[PDB]
Amino acid sequence: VSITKCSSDMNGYCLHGQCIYLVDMSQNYCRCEVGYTGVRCEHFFL
């Protein structure tokens, strides 16, 4: 449970959500907004 945050030049994927980092699987993690219709928070189906 050791997630880290991203920088200013690291938001090039998730538009509506938060940029973080996974320590168990070192990879740029991006939590999208609950309500979007894609795993990259970009097009609001509602």
UniProtKB/Swiss-Prot annotation:
Residues 2-42 form the EGF-like domain. It is found in: Secreted, Extracellular space. Disulfide bonds join 6-19, 14-30, 32-41. Residues 1-46 are extracellular. It comes from the Eukaryota. This is Epiregulin. It comes from Homo sapiens. The chain holds residues 63 to 108 of 169 of the full protein.
